[PDB]
Write an enzyme that holds these catalytic residues in place. Sequence first.
Site, PDB file in Angstrom:
ATOM      1  N   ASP B  60       0.829  -1.184   0.000  1.00  0.00           N
ATOM      2  CA  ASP B  60       0.000   0.000   0.000  1.00  0.00           C
ATOM      3  C   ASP B  60       0.864   1.233   0.000  1.00  0.00           C
ATOM      4  O   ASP B  60       1.116   1.829   1.046  1.00  0.00           O
ATOM      5  CB  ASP B  60      -0.934   0.020   1.215  1.00  0.00           C
ATOM      6  CG  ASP B  60      -2.012   1.103   1.095  1.00  0.00           C
ATOM      7  OD1 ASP B  60      -1.983   1.936   0.155  1.00  0.00           O
ATOM      8  OD2 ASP B  60      -2.909   1.123   1.959  1.00  0.00           O
ATOM      9  N   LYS B  62       0.325   3.878  -2.172  1.00  0.00           N
ATOM     10  CA  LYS B  62      -0.470   5.069  -2.565  1.00  0.00           C
ATOM     11  C   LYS B  62       0.273   5.880  -3.629  1.00  0.00           C
ATOM     12  O   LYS B  62       0.473   7.103  -3.510  1.00  0.00           O
ATOM     13  CB  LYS B  62      -0.770   5.925  -1.324  1.00  0.00           C
ATOM     14  CG  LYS B  62      -1.677   5.133  -0.360  1.00  0.00           C
ATOM     15  CD  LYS B  62      -2.769   5.964   0.203  1.00  0.00           C
ATOM     16  CE  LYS B  62      -3.884   5.157   0.798  1.00  0.00           C
ATOM     17  NZ  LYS B  62      -3.496   3.950   1.574  1.00  0.00           N
ATOM     18  N   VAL B  63       0.740   5.160  -4.650  1.00  0.00           N
ATOM     19  CA  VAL B  63       1.686   5.737  -5.596  1.00  0.00           C
ATOM     20  C   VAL B  63       1.020   6.940  -6.255  1.00  0.00           C
ATOM     21  O   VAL B  63      -0.124   6.873  -6.726  1.00  0.00           O
ATOM     22  CB  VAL B  63       2.084   4.672  -6.657  1.00  0.00           C
ATOM     23  CG1 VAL B  63       3.058   5.275  -7.629  1.00  0.00           C
ATOM     24  CG2 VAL B  63       2.695   3.441  -5.955  1.00  0.00           C
ATOM     25  N   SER B 117     -11.459   6.917   2.856  1.00  0.00           N
ATOM     26  CA  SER B 117     -12.396   6.668   3.948  1.00  0.00           C
ATOM     27  C   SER B 117     -12.447   7.774   5.009  1.00  0.00           C
ATOM     28  O   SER B 117     -13.381   7.836   5.810  1.00  0.00           O
ATOM     29  CB  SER B 117     -12.020   5.343   4.639  1.00  0.00           C
ATOM     30  OG  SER B 117     -10.686   5.400   5.118  1.00  0.00           O
ATOM     31  N   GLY B 173     -13.838  -0.917  11.268  1.00  0.00           N
ATOM     32  CA  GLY B 173     -13.459  -0.956  12.686  1.00  0.00           C
ATOM     33  C   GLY B 173     -13.068   0.408  13.214  1.00  0.00           C
ATOM     34  O   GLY B 173     -13.939   1.246  13.504  1.00  0.00           O
ATOM     35  N   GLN B 175     -11.968   3.154  11.959  1.00  0.00           N
ATOM     36  CA  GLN B 175     -12.455   4.366  11.299  1.00  0.00           C
ATOM     37  C   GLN B 175     -13.980   4.465  11.274  1.00  0.00           C
ATOM     38  O   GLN B 175     -14.527   5.471  10.836  1.00  0.00           O
ATOM     39  CB  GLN B 175     -11.931   4.468   9.866  1.00  0.00           C
ATOM     40  CG  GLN B 175     -10.402   4.565   9.830  1.00  0.00           C
ATOM     41  CD  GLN B 175      -9.896   4.697   8.382  1.00  0.00           C
ATOM     42  OE1 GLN B 175     -10.325   5.596   7.653  1.00  0.00           O
ATOM     43  NE2 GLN B 175      -8.993   3.788   7.962  1.00  0.00           N
TER      44      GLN B 175
HETATM   45  N1  LIG Z   1      -8.128   4.376   0.560  1.00  0.00           N
HETATM   46  C1  LIG Z   1      -8.726   4.548   1.754  1.00  0.00           C
HETATM   47  O1  LIG Z   1      -9.881   4.882   1.930  1.00  0.00           O
HETATM   48  C2  LIG Z   1      -8.023   4.161   2.995  1.00  0.00           C
HETATM   49  N2  LIG Z   1      -8.397   4.237   4.287  1.00  0.00           N
HETATM   50  N3  LIG Z   1      -7.458   3.631   5.127  1.00  0.00           N
HETATM   51  C3  LIG Z   1      -6.436   3.116   4.418  1.00  0.00           C
HETATM   52  C4  LIG Z   1      -5.261   2.373   4.870  1.00  0.00           C
HETATM   53  O2  LIG Z   1      -5.813   1.099   5.246  1.00  0.00           O
HETATM   54  C5  LIG Z   1      -5.439   0.798   6.594  1.00  0.00           C
HETATM   55  C6  LIG Z   1      -6.638   1.010   7.526  1.00  0.00           C
HETATM   56  O3  LIG Z   1      -6.224   0.644   8.839  1.00  0.00           O
HETATM   57  P1  LIG Z   1      -7.253   0.721  10.096  1.00  0.00           P
HETATM   58  O4  LIG Z   1      -8.006   2.022  10.029  1.00  0.00           O
HETATM   59  O5  LIG Z   1      -6.255   0.721  11.217  1.00  0.00           O
HETATM   60  O6  LIG Z   1      -8.109  -0.516  10.007  1.00  0.00           O
HETATM   61  C7  LIG Z   1      -4.283   1.746   6.895  1.00  0.00           C
HETATM   62  O7  LIG Z   1      -3.070   1.190   6.340  1.00  0.00           O
HETATM   63  C8  LIG Z   1      -4.702   2.989   6.133  1.00  0.00           C
HETATM   64  O8  LIG Z   1      -3.570   3.779   5.777  1.00  0.00           O
HETATM   65  C9  LIG Z   1      -6.769   3.425   3.036  1.00  0.00           C
HETATM   66  O9  LIG Z   1      -5.956   3.045   1.895  1.00  0.00           O
END
Ligand SMILES: NC(=O)c1[nH]nc([C@@H]2O[C@H](COP(=O)(O)O)[C@@H](O)[C@H]2O)c1O
Lengths: 214, 214
Positions: B60, B62-63, B117, B173, B175
Amino acid sequence: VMNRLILAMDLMNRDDALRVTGEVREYIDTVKIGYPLVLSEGMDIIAEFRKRFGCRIIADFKVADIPETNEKICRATFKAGADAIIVHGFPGADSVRACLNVAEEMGREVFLLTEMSHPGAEMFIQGAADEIARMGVDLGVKNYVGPSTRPERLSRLREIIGQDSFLISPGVGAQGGDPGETLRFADAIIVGRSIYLADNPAAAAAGIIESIKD
Amino acid sequence: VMNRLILAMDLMNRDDALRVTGEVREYIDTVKIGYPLVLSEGMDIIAEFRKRFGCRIIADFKVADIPETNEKICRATFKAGADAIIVHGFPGADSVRACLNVAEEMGREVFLLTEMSHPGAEMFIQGAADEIARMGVDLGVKNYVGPSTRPERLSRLREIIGQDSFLISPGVGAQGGDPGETLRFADAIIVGRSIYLADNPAAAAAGIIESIKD
Ligand SMILES: NC(=O)c1[nH]nc([C@@H]2O[C@H](COP(=O)(O)O)[C@@H](O)[C@H]2O)c1O
Ligand SMILES: NC(=O)c1[nH]nc([C@@H]2O[C@H](COP(=O)(O)O)[C@@H](O)[C@H]2O)c1O
């Protein structure tokens, strides 16, 4: 920054990266290190560059996650010795604030990415860029990145952030930007391939510097 | 993915990360590894996790750079053994295509980030998200990430990408997202802190799995 020129060191092996940086160090005291080098050679390369060239290091990690993750990324990056980190504004104010909070804790700097230099930037970023810059101002961001390839956009960005904000600009050389034109608006230019892929990087850097001392 | 559950391993030390992953491996065969762990422990952690848990690894990262740099980041990530990489769509189609080109070369997969998210996603990403998803479809992207915290947005995203595209969803969870509701639209859910900060991560993972076998 010395000579208003920042080297983007995106070679992916330590020997070549060290060689080129050493060759151009008399022209440049700030190096931008990104994921191409860090993911190839490790985070310890940041302290090594700092120890051996006595240069400032900006970590170009284009931080672009949720606030909690951004916090972690910034903490790891500053622990590694970076002086500043480059962060995306597109993910919103809370993501940016997370980076600012860690920079405050650690006595470091955040640069905010507004509009990008490449063609695809026109699709989504360009339309949001003025608002991202205004968000930056309202968060107290003092350091910004804007595109050498679109000086009219760099002018508009300067207009939003004012004359006391510090503005650095990539896209010079390889991507088509001009050093002199870009420096009408930016405080410093970032240059990668035009220097590091040159047959003589020192000569390339020197040529750039002579074209802007004018 | 096993049990439709992907562990987001964002602990920042190798010992803790190894311990938790080992404890939950019977429930999860895909691990998402991000910059918090990689920038703390190095890229070799990816091969180590692959060797020791025999799990798929999604990087992950996020490039979010220009095409040339994105190419380099993807090449380094796949060299390190990642099965897939997560890329931002906001920087535009050329940036995404650069990642797809390297994935094609190396026999790997790209996941495209649509709407995020966290609260700040509402500022800029949400308004562009439908168009980013449609860009994905038009580039031939088959794997997508969308937000557990906004199931109405996850529904709209599913509508754009169709039923044959694979969709994974973080924000479950910690979030505020719900596993069951999210799985009405996503193929798999990503869970980090709800598992890895739990007093008993295996029990946390098991609880989630029992709440979705229903
Ligand atoms: N694209 C999105 O909406 C998005 N939301 N959260 C993440 C990533 O997914 C993971 C969420 O972690 P946890 O909340 O602890 O369950 C964490 O690595 C966060 O950086 C993500 O790529
Ligand atoms: N925000 C932007 O507009 C933007 N454009 N390019 C870069 C980064 O700046 C560097 C430009 O390198 P070179 O073209 O070779 O002079 C390279 O690291 C690239 O990823 C960047 O952050």
